[PDB]
């Protein structure tokens, strides 16, 4: 039965999810593919993290057990919080809470994985990742975005 959403449409939201089920299905797979884009597309991203330290090709990156499991981590949270629908406040608090803090990642950086999510969501989905699958995705993402700044606002990290 339904589930009333938040700012995007139930058909926007149909679209998002039904790309997402695919995305789970290969979640390693598809976690390795995006930070790999995300590293090759802007390096910093790499600086920040220590176990990415000696990582410089993509067959170290693609060997990497720990790039693996960070890629299924941040990978099954997303779609936590976007099965949610954008009723996420509560899933966003403790995620904000780490990454403000523990991990200092700032807004820009998730503006740089949802390029690298719609990019490879295109180049492996041309089944359900379609102009109108990805305007949805791109709402979602950035409902995301807008609601995870928000959060860190109300912690005073200045993103």
């Given at each position: 039965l339904y589930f009333q959403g938040k700012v995007l449409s139930e058909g926007e939201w149909q679209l998002v999810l039904h790309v997402w089920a695919k995305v789970e299905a290969d979640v390693a797979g598809h976690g390795q593919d995006i930070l790999i884009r995300l590293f090759k597309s802007h390096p910093e991203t790499l600086?920040?993290?220590?176990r990415f330290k000696h990582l410089k090709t993509e067959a170290e990156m693609k060997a990497s057990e720990d790039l693996k499991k960070i890629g299924v981590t941040v990978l099954t949270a997303l779609?936590?919080?976007l099965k949610k629908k954008g009723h996420h406040?509560?899933?966003l608090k403790p995620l904000a809470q780490s990454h403000a803090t523990k991990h200092k990642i700032p807004?820009?950086?998730l503006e740089f994985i949802s390029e690298a999510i719609i990019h490879v969501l295109h180049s492996r989905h041309?089944?359900?990742?379609?102009?109108?699958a990805q305007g949805a995705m791109n709402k979602a993402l950035e409902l995301f975005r807008?609601?995870?700044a928000a959060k860190y606002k109300e912690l005073g990290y200045q993103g």
């Open positions: 600086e920040k993290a220590d779609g936590a919080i406040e509560a899933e807004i820009k950086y041309p089944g359900n990742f379609g102009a109108d807008k609601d995870i």
